Write an enzyme that holds these catalytic residues in place. Structure first.
Site, short mmCIF file in Angstrom:
data_model
loop_
_atom_site.label_atom_id
_atom_site.label_comp_id
_atom_site.label_asym_id
_atom_site.label_seq_id
_atom_site.Cartn_x
_atom_site.Cartn_y
_atom_site.Cartn_z
N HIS A 41 24.05 24.65 29.58
CA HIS A 41 22.34 23.49 29.77
C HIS A 41 21.47 24.13 28.73
CE1 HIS A 41 19.49 25.97 31.78
NE2 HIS A 41 19.66 26.31 33.28
N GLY A 134 12.89 30.44 32.72
CA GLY A 134 13.29 30.84 32.16
C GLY A 134 14.21 32.17 32.21
N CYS A 136 17.16 31.82 34.03
CA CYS A 136 18.70 30.89 33.96
C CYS A 136 19.21 31.90 33.24
CB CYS A 136 18.43 29.85 33.33
SG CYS A 136 17.24 28.27 34.49
C1 LIG Z 1 15.31 24.78 33.00
O1 LIG Z 1 16.28 24.38 34.36
C2 LIG Z 1 15.74 24.00 35.28
C3 LIG Z 1 15.37 24.62 36.39
O2 LIG Z 1 15.90 24.31 37.45
N1 LIG Z 1 14.81 25.68 35.42
C4 LIG Z 1 14.42 26.44 36.44
C5 LIG Z 1 15.55 27.81 37.67
N2 LIG Z 1 15.04 28.22 38.19
C6 LIG Z 1 13.63 28.52 38.69
C7 LIG Z 1 12.30 27.74 37.15
C8 LIG Z 1 11.51 27.87 38.03
C9 LIG Z 1 9.97 27.53 37.76
C10 LIG Z 1 10.66 26.27 36.92
C11 LIG Z 1 12.55 26.37 36.58
C12 LIG Z 1 13.15 27.29 36.52
C13 LIG Z 1 14.01 22.35 35.63
C14 LIG Z 1 14.77 21.16 34.67
O3 LIG Z 1 15.83 20.78 35.13
C15 LIG Z 1 16.91 21.68 35.22
C16 LIG Z 1 18.26 20.43 35.38
F1 LIG Z 1 17.87 19.05 35.42
C17 LIG Z 1 18.77 21.50 35.55
C18 LIG Z 1 19.20 22.26 35.28
F2 LIG Z 1 20.22 23.23 35.84
C19 LIG Z 1 17.95 23.50 35.31
C20 LIG Z 1 17.10 22.69 35.07
#
Ligand SMILES: CO[C@@]1(C(=O)Nc2cncc3ccccc23)CCOc2c(F)cc(F)cc21
Ligand SMILES: CO[C@@]1(C(=O)Nc2cncc3ccccc23)CCOc2c(F)cc(F)cc21
Lengths: 296, 300
Positions: A41, A134, A136
């Protein structure tokens, strides 16, 4: 003495953490030999990847920019071929773990490790991690002798605050997808073999109040366990608890009767290893390793 | 989202762990530049442990009595000196993996990561706090002596603890990296007992703020309290007194969540009176006191 939630030493993994930037998205990558692995992603993923060129991916290992010379996708992981092999690459393997198995997580932000914690793959395939935006690309691992076994890469946070990710081959743990859609973690269950391992750790540490004179059949225990949303206990689990049963003198079905009473009656203001709840994130191998001092 | 007990990445400290052997004793040392730091009881036998004269025992030792092993390489000791309860073995090779570091003495309530080692090899990393009674509730087996506690700020390792002993209750005592013990403990086998432990109140309040940030609000109430009334209630539950410094430190979390410190204090008083009633806060059925206000802001 003492029992703590303990992670593996993170040093071998810290040497592999890099920052991967593509457009506006910055996340973490795992640099092993001349390949950088990260969640796809960061970029119809086949269609989006074809449109990208090697110079669109900015990889930073510390204060040094690595040059990307190739890119390919394996399931939900992107592999960025780089021109320099990581000199800090440890002996490693990619392993897919089962629900109940524990691993250490090296939480990173901008390719820089900020924390290490221990956790378990829940029976519903989520991890109850600690991740901000961040994080990820942060990885989960175990260490066997001098070999790092990479088992998890963080991809997303579900609406309940729990986390979903893949093995290092890009295959998600659980029924999750790396797309923006309505996704929900299933109802979670307690990892029974890990609770029993933790009750053995409590006995080794001198905490014996929960022990009783009784034993149970594996079937009677499983009928009771099912009522309390506890995972079924298999004969494999009974066999794995064997060494702890031998060390403490408490047969597994004997400890199962203690667990059965604990579930039907509660703790009654008492604690086990400083906890008022039954801990299920220590595997039997974790208990033996900590109550024996195995080093890495 | 999520809240975990989280240790610092241990890599910078792993590159400093060495095995120190003197006679029959083998424990861990911390190799920084050309000095190896370790508990001075490495020079003791079982017969010296009760009333050891460390100055007398150290004057009888020579550099070749200390065997230092960094991985599969033996380091040569070219000097030795004692600073309080720590032994400093000067070596002929400066550790190339020496990070940017500082020696810091911490106060009760402060948290740090422990890199548990055996035979100069790291086996695990965990997080813990300096208890108000100056002990740590660690996980240490025999051979863990010399394992260190640290924090990391940006690129600098602040060493704050070196493990020396296990008290009869299973809790642990040690020194800062200058050899000064935390608490009224001595590195002798004389009868020693940890004082009655208390809950780190400012840490519990920081953790209640972390729970609010993470969406947990069931424990909140309409009440506020005076600092004195809170302290009178707190003391009855073996909770540390909350000072005006603690109230000031919780300021940023109070501003972020919109709940005043004395307002959160009234929630804590209610939790102490009622218990949790089958409910949990951040997956815990007890009030967590090993997350400082600085850790809560760092992690959230
Ligand atoms: C940017 O990746 C996303 C996410 O979950 N991120 C995160 C992962 N960990 C902790 C988080 C804490 C707070 C904020 C986001 C977090 C957000 C948007 O939707 C998605 C999505 F549809 C698919 C995806 F594989 C990732 C994500
Ligand atoms: C160096 O040995 C001692 C020790 O506590 N070691 C340990 C430290 N950690 C965990 C332990 C788990 C189990 C067994 C020992 C442990 C035990 C003997 O008495 C003493 C002593 F009078 C002074 C001293 F500074 C150390 C020690």
């Amino acid at each position: 003495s003492g029992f703590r939630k303990m992670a593996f030493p993170s040093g071998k993994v810290e040497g592999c953490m890099v920052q991967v930037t593509c457009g506006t998205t910055t996340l973490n990558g795992l640099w092993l030999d001349d390949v950088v692995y990260c969640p796809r992603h960061v970029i119809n993923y086949e269609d989006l990847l074809i449109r990208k060129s090697n110079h669109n991916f900015l990889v930073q290992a510390g204060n040094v920019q690595l040059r990307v010379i190739g890119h390919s996708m394996q399931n939900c992981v992107l592999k960025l071929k780089v021109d320099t092999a990581n000199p800090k690459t440890p002996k490693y393997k990619f392993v897919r773990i089962q629900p109940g198995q524990t691993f250490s997580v090296l939480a990173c932000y901008n390719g820089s490790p900020s924390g290490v914690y221990q956790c378990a793959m829940r029976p519903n395939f989520t991890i109850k991690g600690s991740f901000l935006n961040g994080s990820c690309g942060s990885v989960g691992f175990n260490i066997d002798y001098d070999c790092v076994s990479f088992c998890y890469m963080h991809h997303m946070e579900l609406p309940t605050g729990v986390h979903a990710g893949t093995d290092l081959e890009g295959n998600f743990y659980g029924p999750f997808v790396d797309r923006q859609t309505a996704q929900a973690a299933g109802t979670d269950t307690t990892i029974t073999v890990n609770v029993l391992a933790w009750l053995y750790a409590a006995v080794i540490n001198g905490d014996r109040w929960f022990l009783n004179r009784f034993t149970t059949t594996l079937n009677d225990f499983n009928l009771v366990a099912m009522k309390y949303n506890y995972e079924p206990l298999t004969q494999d689990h009974v066999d794995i608890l064997g060494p702890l049963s031998a060390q403490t003198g408490i047969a597994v079905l004997d400890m199962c009767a203690s667990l059965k009473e604990l579930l039907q009656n509660g703790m009654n203001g008492r604690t086990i290893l400083g906890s008022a709840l039954l801990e299920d994130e220590f595997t039997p191998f974790d208990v033996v390793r900590q109550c024996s001092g195995v080093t890495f």
